[PDB]
Amino acid sequence: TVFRQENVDDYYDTGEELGSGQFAVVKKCREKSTGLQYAAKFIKKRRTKSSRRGVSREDIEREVSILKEIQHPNVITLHEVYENKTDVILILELVAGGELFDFLAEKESLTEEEATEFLKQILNGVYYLHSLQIAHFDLKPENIMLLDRNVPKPRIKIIDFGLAHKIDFGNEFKNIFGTPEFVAPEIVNYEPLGLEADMWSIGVITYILLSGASPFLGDTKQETLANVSAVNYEFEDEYFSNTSALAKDFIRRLLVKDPKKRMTIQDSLQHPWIKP
Ligand SMILES: Oc1ccc(/C=C/c2cc(O)cc(O)c2)cc1
């Protein structure tokens, strides 16, 4: 599938840089014809077939195909796609309140109400995705953006679909692998992967929201991965002494090694800590 090959600078003006990663940079932009504002994600293309720099066409097209499908208040929306010899440029909805990761650095720990206010929106977004058989595979606070961080109950949107896959056969067997602190044991063990892997990541996020601490984080990446596989975490009293047993129950039913025994997204929405 080919994308718009006119110069993006003919149609948009860029501004503040919002972030950058290994193969991409995101810049605020403004569409000339409407004055409306977006985030432009420039993804570096692979320059040869056998290279390891840049992102393969197959991987770019999968991300674009998934983004084109989704429209939901808690997921980012794709506006347009451009490309040139060096980059594919996603014109994405602008979400200007920053990462949930940076928001948590400020408060350093949330109440259960503040945590469930965020979590309910994350769960609603993931329920939408899983209903479409889309696994995100990279859920973490860096990939949750706030619309406005200066309100009491910030609204969020899930971003960064670069690892997302359609799961039409119940599982994918692809060596998909994200951030060690958040990946499920089946990712660590290179096993077939399904929607269940996102539910583990939600359990990790929930633990972090409530405590300010990461449940499996070791001193090195290999230690973190070994801890995940062994389900080596505990609810430290110093962090969780005033946290309800029902919140711990929610986490405990997500941080389950066997994916078939883990809570599904529907289970999480009916769990008594969440369900109204
Ligand atoms: O597949 C995707 C890949 C990356 C993104 C990132 C979007 C994004 C949008 C913003 O408004 C601000 C931002 O800092 C990031 C969204 C989807």
Description:
- This is Death-associated protein kinase 1.
- ATP binds at residues 18-26, 41, 93-95, 99, 160.
- Belongs to the protein kinase superfamily. CAMK Ser/Thr protein kinase family. DAP kinase subfamily.
- By secondary structure, this protein is an alpha+beta fold.
- The protein folds into 2 domains: 7-97, no CATH class; 98-276, no CATH class.
- It has 9 helices and 9 strands.
- The chain has helices at 57-69, 100-107, 112-131, 185-188, 196-211, 221-229, 237-240, 245-254, 265-270, and strands spanning 12-20, 24-31, 37-44, 78-83, 87-93, 134-135, 144-146, 156-158, 165-166.
- A 5-stranded antiparallel sheet has the order 1-2-3-5-4, covered by helices on one side.
- Helix 3 (112-131) packs antiparallel against helix 5 and helix 5 runs antiparallel to helix 8 (245-254).
- The longest helix has 20 residues, at 112-131.
- The chain is globular.
- It starts with 11 loop residues before the first strand and ends in a 6-residue tail after the last helix.
- Resveratrol (STL) binds at residues 18-19, 26, 39, 41, 63, 67, 76, 92-95, 145, 159-162.
